[PDB]
Write a protein that binds this ligand. Structure first.
Ligand SMILES: Nc1nc2c(ncn2[C@@H]2O[C@H](COP(=O)(O)OP(=O)(O)OP(=O)(O)O)[C@@H](O)[C@H]2O)c(=O)[nH]1
Length: 227
């Protein structure tokens, strides 16, 4: 609804997704089939490269406008990829944490309610992204949204979502150890003890998933189009 308000102001939409989880970070629920929509697969720098290419092929086959990029990509390569039409008025949209502010700041640079900023060719872009929250009752979706850091650990109330997330992590990296062992070792290995000198698993989970989202646990993707 807040987002629906924002959509009446624009004709073009950039959906910023995480390349590691292009389905989980889709903007399902909100309708922008009336807009010109670009699927932007962000953070390819911390994603499994062959999985990224397979997502590109997949979205292409469905006749969708899709690009890939990351923080380090020069502004000029991003604009080149996006190739906005002359009359474009653009909304940057996505679920939390996918890199929407980072992209706006790149698009802005040293450039001057919600206000537009203009590219050198007149194209307008809202300076604030629309944040989409979507409905989560599948365990798998929660787990994937946790892995990309779109969903807070605080907001996870079932331990099986932590185990799902870890199963996805382990499988897609190589690990084969048990959940409980991994996180006991992780909590010691990181100095996370509670009263009595007992490993703080809660904190281990929070820190670990934070480091996974941040790409600090290896170049890893969490879903594949074959899945
Ligand atoms: N490795 C990597 N990290 C990125 C990339 N883009 C953004 N980030 C990081 O991801 C985190 C969140 O990015 P933001 O740009 O703040 O994303 P956002 O969508 O505006 O986040 P929300 O405000 O929660 O909706 C930050 O720590 C960024 O540094 C990327 O392309 N590669």
């Amino acid at each position: 609804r807040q987002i629906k308000d924002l959509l009446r102001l624009v004709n073009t939409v950039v959906e910023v997704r995480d390349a590691r989880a292009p389905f989980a970070t889709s903007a399902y629920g909100v309708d922008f089939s009336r807009k010109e929509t670009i699927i932007l697969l962000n953070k390819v720098d911390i994603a499994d490269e062959k999985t990224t290419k397979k997502w590109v092929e997949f979205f292409k086959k469905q006749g969708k406008r899709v690009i890939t990029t990351h923080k380090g990509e020069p502004r000029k390569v991003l604009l080149k990829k996006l190739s906005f039409d002359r009359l474009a008025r653009v909304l940057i949209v996505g679920v939390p944490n996918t890199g929407k502010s980072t992209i706006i700041n790149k698009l802005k640079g040293k450039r001057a309610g919600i206000q537009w900023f203009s590219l050198e060719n007149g194209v307008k872009i809202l300076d604030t992204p629309g944040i989409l929250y979507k409905n989560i009752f599948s365990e798998d979706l929660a787990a994937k949204l946790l892995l990309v850091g779109s969903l807070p650990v605080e907001r996870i109330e079932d331990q099986r979502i932590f185990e799902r997330a870890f199963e996805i992590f382990a499988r897609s990296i190589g690990i084969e150890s048990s959940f409980s062992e991994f996180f006991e070792d992780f909590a010691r290995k990181r100095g996370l003890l509670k009263k009595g000198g007992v490993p703080d698993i809660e904190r281990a989970l929070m820190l670990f998933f934070t480091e996974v989202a941040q790409g600090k646990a290896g170049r890893v993707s969490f879903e594949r189009p074959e899945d």
